[PDB]
Scaffold this active site. Structure first.
Site, mmCIF file in Angstrom:
data_model
loop_
_atom_site.group_PDB
_atom_site.id
_atom_site.type_symbol
_atom_site.label_atom_id
_atom_site.label_comp_id
_atom_site.label_asym_id
_atom_site.label_seq_id
_atom_site.Cartn_x
_atom_site.Cartn_y
_atom_site.Cartn_z
ATOM 1 C CB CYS A 1 68.879 2.916 -10.354
ATOM 2 S SG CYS A 1 67.101 3.659 -10.482
ATOM 3 C CD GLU B 1 68.760 -3.658 -13.270
ATOM 4 O OE1 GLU B 1 67.627 -3.451 -12.424
ATOM 5 O OE2 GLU B 1 69.011 -2.604 -13.678
ATOM 6 C CG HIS C 1 65.856 -0.178 -13.393
ATOM 7 N ND1 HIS C 1 64.787 -0.506 -12.666
ATOM 8 C CD2 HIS C 1 66.557 0.884 -12.470
ATOM 9 C CE1 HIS C 1 64.548 0.171 -11.344
ATOM 10 N NE2 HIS C 1 65.695 1.216 -11.533
#
EC number: 4.3.2.10
Lengths: 253, 200
Positions: free
Chosen positions: B84, B180, B178
């Site tokens: 990012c 995650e 992202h």
């Protein structure tokens, strides 16, 4: 292509998942964290946590919730319900929440929407708008749908976007919890008034209702009952929506 | 295996850390450290996360003297993975912070997507040239990468606009999404990274 989203809502109280028909016999339906991990395994794209905790305890129970979720969840989540100021919002976001949802506190102080956006960015602000028909017009309601603010839905979505909101959670008080279908008429009413993403909420009962919400212009369909009870398999739903022209997040084997 | 995660740049980075610890799980002697300042030793795999203004992140890497530290990682042939905001910090400059130079480890600059729905937020498909799994990941950015074709590693289209969602220059890797927050697909992407660093 950006995907149309399937969102799962978890109404929670004092750290646990609750499911009933009202405070009535509001009952205990499990651990918020573990249920979220299950929703992420079947294909849900996002989570919305709606808390109604006691009150004096509202602020500390929500922080505990965010933290418990943030250490185990692998998909985005919004938190809301009783977030009345910038402080509360900033602590939830700093705590681990991806977005916060404000409704009643947004209508009384539109500058709030802006305060959060200026620090965390529009991307972190979801304004939940609860609306219903009253004498032929679409009216906004606060205090969990118990007060008619007198503000029209048409002027409010415009005001909301202007203030900086990054997404709208549009709930129809009329269809909420009825399993009859989403209020596609209300969705179409709002679609042209704003460019912000619209999460359709209320009335979800079967797979086709999702197809209806998306044809109305919704960017995402939220529901709680249906996925929990297993009444709807998310995999089946995404394949059904894709079959009929809707671009959805289809995992794969 | 020593994995480090710069934790100063703005935004949430703990999610990245957690996603990574959860990924480094099924692996032998693999640790994780929050790189909050220049260490004495160099990591086998380093992550440059963050989410926010390009100026900041740059002004946070400088301030806590990590710039020189990061730069030493590339040189020793140590993976350096941006994520990012941190993938954009791998480039020269951004229309976000005109004057402000960035790390510049990769040839290119950062321009604002040319879409009227400015914040590109949601699940979108990523098509990889190889290695990582093709699929949908979660995105939340306003700016993008402008680099030669040579470094494009992953592509995604949003509102007709096609942009490099992934980036690569040898052992340096960048990802605009992202991982995650990308469910099951995100973990395999994170694992594949760790599996690529088990070699050098």
């Amino acid at each position: 292509m950006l995907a149309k989203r399937i969102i799962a809502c978890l109404n929670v109280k004092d750290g646990r998942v609750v499911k009933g028909t009202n405070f009535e016999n509001l009952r205990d339906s499990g651990d918020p964290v573990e249920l979220g991990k299950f929703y992420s395994e079947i294909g849900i794209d996002e989570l919305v946590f709606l808390d109604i905790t006691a009150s004096v305890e509202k602020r500390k129970t929500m922080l505990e919730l965010v933290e418990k979720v943030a250490e185990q969840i692998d998909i985005p989540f919004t938190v809301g319900g009783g977030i009345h100021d910038f402080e509360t919002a900033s602590e939830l976001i700093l705590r681990g929440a991806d977005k916060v949802s404000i409704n009643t506190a947004a209508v009384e102080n539109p500058s709030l929407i802006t305060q959060i956006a200026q620090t965390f960015g529009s991307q972190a602000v979801v304004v939940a708008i609860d609306a219903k028909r009253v004498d032929g017009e679409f009216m906004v309601f606060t205090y969990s749908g118990k007060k008619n603010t007198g503000i029209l839905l048409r002027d409010w979505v415009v005001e909301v976007e202007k203030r900086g909101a990054g997404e709208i959670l549009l709930t129809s008080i009329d269809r909420d919890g009825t399993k009859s279908g989403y209020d596609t008429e209300m969705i179409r009413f709002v679609r042209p008034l704003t460019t912000l993403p619209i999460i359709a909420s209320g009335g979800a009962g079967k797979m086709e209702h999702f197809l209806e919400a998306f044809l109305a212009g919704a960017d995402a369909a939220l529901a709680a009952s249906v996925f929990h009870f297993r009444e709807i398999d998310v995999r089946e739903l995404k394949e059904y929506l894709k079959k009929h022209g809707v671009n959805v997040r289809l995992e794969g084997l | 295996m020593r994995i480090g995660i710069i934790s100063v740049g703005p935004g949430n980075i703990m999610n990245l850390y957690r996603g990574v610890k959860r990924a480094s799980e099924n692996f032998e002697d693999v640790s994780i450290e929050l790189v909050e300042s220049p260490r004495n030793d160099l990591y086998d795999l380093l992550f440059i996360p963050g989410v926010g203004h390009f100026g900041e992140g740059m002004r946070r890497l400088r301030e806590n003297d990590l710039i020189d530290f990061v730069r030493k990682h590339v040189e020793d042939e140590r993976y350096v993975v941006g994520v990012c905001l941190g993938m954009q910090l791998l480039f020269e400059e951004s229309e976000e912070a005109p004057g402000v130079k960035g790390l510049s480890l990769i040839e290119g600059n950062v321009v604002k997507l040319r879409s009227r729905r400015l914040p590109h937020m949601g699940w979108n498909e990523v098509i990889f040239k190889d290695t990582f799994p093709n699929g949908y990941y979660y995105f939340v950015h306003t700016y993008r990468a402008v680099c030669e074709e040579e470094h494009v590693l992953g592509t995604t289209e949003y509102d007709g606009e096609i942009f490099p969602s992934a980036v690569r220059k040898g052992r340096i890797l960048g990802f605009q999404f992202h991982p995650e927050k990308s469910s099951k697909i995100g973990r395999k992407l994170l694992e594949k990274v760790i599996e690529c660093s088990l070699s050098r």
